[PDB]
Symmetry: D2
Subunit: 434 residues, 4 copies
């Protein structure tokens, strides 16, 4: 927080929203007991109607008690309009029956938002890919010219990566979509198992099949690792935008608005600042992942060490990821692409990108692979170091030119060959209407 927090996600993590969730858990729990016949219907009707809290009082009481949940229930007890029935608030419950169930309910909400952000990002990627299906450009391996590809295929790669991440996310969201109301040490000793079933059902959560004082933190570790993975996928794509905007390359550029200023001292600057910002946040979220894993080995039926960490990392990770998904989705959507610079750059390594095809054709004419490679390599290295065209050199090279005709040589130097399966890949990905 706070320039990295959008309003939708910030709102779910307020104290107000937390205490509201606690109150709802408590009231549902009394309603469950009343269904069982263990406490009177009339008592709980009153609790549902009149039970409330004043946050400032919660905090005042907490100054004495040094205990959140006790402060909360004692504050609820002082609601103008509750009478004796206040008796039943927290009946049979332990602290984390409320805290963990409420926390899972809040995460359920966060995860609905994140799922929607992720689906929207996938659509943006799909739309960009279709736009640049045949936008030809150099493929680069080790940062060096390899062979041609298209910007659409690059975006199609990202699209498919994010679909993998949507699936992973659903599984992670599910592992934390659970509540527990099993009492002090998870035994149900003081609280009928039906109470948990009812409360969880009414919050859209599953009931933990077995619990201690708390939910088990393997769930939250799985969850954070998935958040960190999504962020790290986004960093991968941001790193790519940054590389393509480099001045020698300029195949792409982040949208630059009227009135924008790129730097304080250099009026000419247009920078990939959005993508750089995403890179930073991905690092923070990976740190949260390490924290989450360290929260797993809790002692016995619990220690509370995870809570102080989760107070930080759960709001911060979800807030940051929501911000990243929305901001970077807009960066991609509004991204300027320069097909002319892409084609020009394919020119800049003297046609050396055709070296494999010359080699493979030599093999077709019955040369052994290492013999073909070793004829072609010195020619390629000569072009590098004397900066003369590679086709010239193979044409002026008589042991190739004895095995390949001129029209065979020319076919080796045609980039169109490399576009032959773009449509078939897109068809697989679902990116056509063929």
């Amino acid at each position: 927080i706070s320039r990295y927090t959008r309003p939708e996600m910030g709102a779910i993590w307020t104290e107000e929203n937390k205490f509201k969730a606690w109150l709802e858990v408590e009231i549902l729990a009394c309603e469950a007991w009343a269904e069982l016949g263990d406490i009177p219907k009339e008592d709980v009707k009153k609790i549902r109607e009149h039970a409330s809290f004043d946050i400032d009082r919660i905090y005042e009481i907490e100054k004495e008690t040094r205990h959140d949940v006790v402060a909360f229930t004692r504050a609820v007890s002082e609601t103008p309009a509750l009478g004796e029935e206040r008796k039943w608030v927290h009946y049979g419950l332990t602290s984390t029956d409320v805290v963990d169930t409420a926390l899972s309910y809040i995460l359920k909400q966060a995860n609905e938002i994140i799922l929607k952000d992720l689906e929207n990002f996938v659509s943006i990627l799909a739309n960009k890919a279709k736009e640049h299906k045949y936008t030809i450009m150099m493929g680069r391996t080790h940062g060096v010219h390899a062979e041609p590809t298209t910007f659409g295929l690059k975006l199609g790669l990202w699209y498919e990566e994010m679909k993998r991440n949507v699936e992973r996310f659903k599984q992670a969201a599910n592992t934390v979509r659970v509540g527990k109301l099993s009492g002090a040490v998870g035994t149900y000793a003081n609280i009928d198992p039906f109470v948990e079933k009812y409360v969880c059902e009414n919050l859209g959560l599953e009931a933990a099949p077995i619990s201690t004082q708390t939910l088990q933190r393997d769930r939250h570790a799985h969850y954070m690792s998935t958040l960190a993975l999504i962020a790290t996928s986004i960093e991968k794509m941001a790193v790519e935008i940054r590389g393509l905007q480099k001045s020698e390359t300029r195949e792409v550029e982040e949208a630059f608005a009227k009135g924008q200023k790129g730097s304080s001292a250099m009026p000419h600057k247009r920078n990939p600042i959005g993508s750089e910002n995403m890179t930073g946040l991905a690092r923070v979220i990976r740190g949260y992942m390490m924290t989450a894993y360290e929260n797993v080995p809790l002692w016995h039926e619990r220690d509370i060490s995870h809570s102080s960490a989760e107070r930080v990392i759960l709001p911060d990770a979800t807030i940051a990821l929501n911000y990243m998904l929305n901001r970077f989705g807009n960066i991609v959507k509004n991204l300027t692409v320069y097909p002319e610079n892409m084609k020009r750059n394919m020119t800049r390594t003297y046609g050396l990108i055709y070296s494999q095809r010359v080699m493979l054709t030599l093999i077709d004419k019955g040369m052994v692979r290492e013999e073909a490679y070793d004829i072609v390599q010195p020619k390629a290295m000569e072009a590098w170091e004397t900066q003369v065209q590679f086709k010239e050199l193979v044409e002026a090279d008589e042991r190739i030119t004895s095995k390949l005709t001129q029209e065979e040589i020319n076919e080796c130097f045609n980039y169109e060959h490399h576009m032959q399966h773009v449509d078939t890949i897109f068809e697989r990905l679902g990116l056509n209407e063929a």
Copy 2:
């Protein structure tokens, strides 16, 4: 590495096994082209029958080549039994068509073993849980006596955690059960799409729907995070054994063998050494997860930074987890339980563990929660301070004994009350009736 490495897993990571995997990918790729009609059946028959490699020669050639895949294919071409058909080896393939596809193949073998280990460990936890289903002991929260539970429910919690981990593992194993043979930058420009399909199917791998020169490393990051999560679950259980074996409590002890010595200087020692060992290895694996995440943001259609890192972390994590699952499963299996110590320990906090039951019964009789709590708390704190039994203090307060019969007071102090849902939990878990 090597006191922590079992032969079953060590065998799948030898160099010889890698290069055997590489050879098979090459031969299958040739066989695919022959089915396409693009290379003579005659030629591939000879390749399948005779292609081989000498491993010392691979290393010799790499000294000059500074390139392992080239060293490999050149070594294959030196196979005396191969004639000119050697021309076809690696035809249309890029380095990593072999390396990544073979790596996934080796990982599939590793994962078959780890799934087996996970399933053996789940079974060990089930047997132990059933054995100790009614072994009464203190539940502890914040390390301090809370209310009774059973050792079986503690073991059942580990069982269900490992079931969650098995499902996580199946997802993770699947995300890396993929191959690619799409040529230099993933375009199929030099290699018919059918070759990939043929090769992957023959190795039991899915074909990446879209690739570059490499598989995308979000997969390997998901995978490593799941290995680390399993390790961290094992740490949690290991820390519990270490806690329960502490001298003041001694509710459990690791099996101590005839001829074993616990320390160099103190003949009386018996230590939770196995558990301590698991804790250290979990730390190591969590480090490997961070490494894997940092491997995701590769440049463009790939950089090779992930390779050096994967050579360390992929064998080391799989070897270490296989060792941990086996060693810790044995620790649990052979673990010594002291139910008499467990019962003794429930006695040591003066019956204070029944404080909740007295408070709740007081609410049943009409007291508001804060009134009940604040009657009971001082008596509780008095017992801590004074070494007198909580029950006696409860029986001396007229405003309690006016509302509770002796029967009812006596019910509060019965631990059998706390075992009332052990069976209902076990039934959910599937742990009932054999």
Copy 3:
């Protein structure tokens, strides 16, 4: 933030405080140029007198510019009371000349606070150690009874660890106590090297000997690793308090106030909640450390990826550490110690802690080590499993009792022997006035 933020540290990280630091950098820079004679003294006098900013305007301008520093300088330009001299604000500067120098100045302030917190914690430790110099208790290795030590020596260990950390901290504080004003790419091309010397001197910073657009992030990585180390030392000590407060053990207890409530459902509870909270925060700060290291490989003369991460981790780490040092120092200071429970616990393993001394005395009487160990071990293991006193068993054991007299046996069972060097250790540490 925010229940984990004390007012001293929160105040330095406000936007207001940041923009004030930016303004001071800018004014100092104009004052330097005027010393050089490059801009008129009268112009800069006016800038020193009248230059200011309105934060709401900074933010409004930033909406257009999408650029912090430009928004700031343009806002400064609109100060009622600056005239033409506004010309010279940011003259020769690049953005991060201001941002990095101002950030280092803010960190200097944070680090003055942290140093004082650390010194205060060291004093608290020293005072507690002197208090319990001869407070005898069991030493435990692998969680199991080893030999006696004293609680003073335990605290003396912590004291010495924190002195190591004060030294590490000074070095870390120093590595980040540097500014740069070297212009767009660190060349001084547009800004005389004297400007940097003057500004840094006037902010209590060193001038970076060589810089790019930014300070190098190895410094901030070193810095965060030290913050994380201090937090992790505190976790080590918190883990110890938690272990010693366990109900079977109760050698120590966190202070519990009149009116405090230990749990919501269990009135008897007194928990080590402070120590548990410290454990959680140490995990968060270690995550920040991983983030900081990932900030090091910046591209060329900089990318801005570090900034979005540092906006989070630098305030959060320093705020959290300041909170930890103050809170945990008060936990130790106010900690209840139970010397009677410590002495009682030394009793609970049947005198087995004397096994080494029986062994060593056997060796003195001319037994080979393995012969002495192997006579003593079964006796020790018999006492464990039949729960009878170890001294009885050695006394009733005729191959010891033939080599050692009764008064030699009795000397082996004297704990006073183990206190003989407490004073000599304390003398070394500086914890005496001998």
Copy 4:
């Protein structure tokens, strides 16, 4: 591990070297007791002269003992040449008196080697910086052209970073240059304080002022964080080489050997493979740092969880860093620089890099900053859009050419201006005049 392991460092981590270190600690401890008068000189003379061990026998004994130090001392006692004086081996010592003291001894050997490597690498960077002190090239911020710098200043920045790392390393090496021989729980109860002093001094170690059964792991965490910081500095430099070798820019290339092959399929490739390799190993080492931090919170007077972890990370980190320092130093030494490409590239952004110089000169002539900036920005953006030279656009604006003479305009577009303080920086760094 093993293509990444040099003999110099591999040799210090063999088992034989460990056990030799263990033997020497034992013999020195006996020699100390003899100087005290507590064991006969006669006896220790024989121990020093004859004590040995068979390594296969250590492992045999450990199979039964499940304890390596006991297996070691029992193996020493089987030395045929030793008589009853074998009685004294390990007298008063605890397991870790040997293991930790010997570990620090081995680490001291490792660190002598790493300091040597660090110093060799600093020298390589100095030579390269001096060679290229005036090799003009673009400075790049956010990956985009900013202003000119020199390759020598870039190398000088690495030089000074490594000097910071050398000082960090000396501090870290020192924090682990410590031994302990204080008995079971650090009390000297069984072992005269003089033994420790004697042993440490003879091994070139400091004696821990206070210890437990082990040295405190804050030391090893400091140490590992410094190893990771060096690795991460190397990554940063490696990423720069990889950036500059990209095909569009080609300002640098790793040395490419006769007979080397860059790829299996593309004979034209020359890749920054060394640099890519360093990047991967830095990731691994950062993982080991996290592990080391998790080893700090050991229980009470120790648990052994750190041991299994240290067996992996201490050899692996030191071996990997020694490999990285040597390999990357060679990469830099042998690196190919293309100053003609560097000059060519400065041309590719239409002279826009001189935008700041025109703006500042306009301020010199009386324009307010926002006025100067906003005159210059549109011309800059016009040049980007239109492929016309910035200088020509500047010369067509009357409100510029009315204030600047042709001389002055021509000065703005001179890169020599930007080399004016290269020497002043080099002098600070100590890089001048040989």
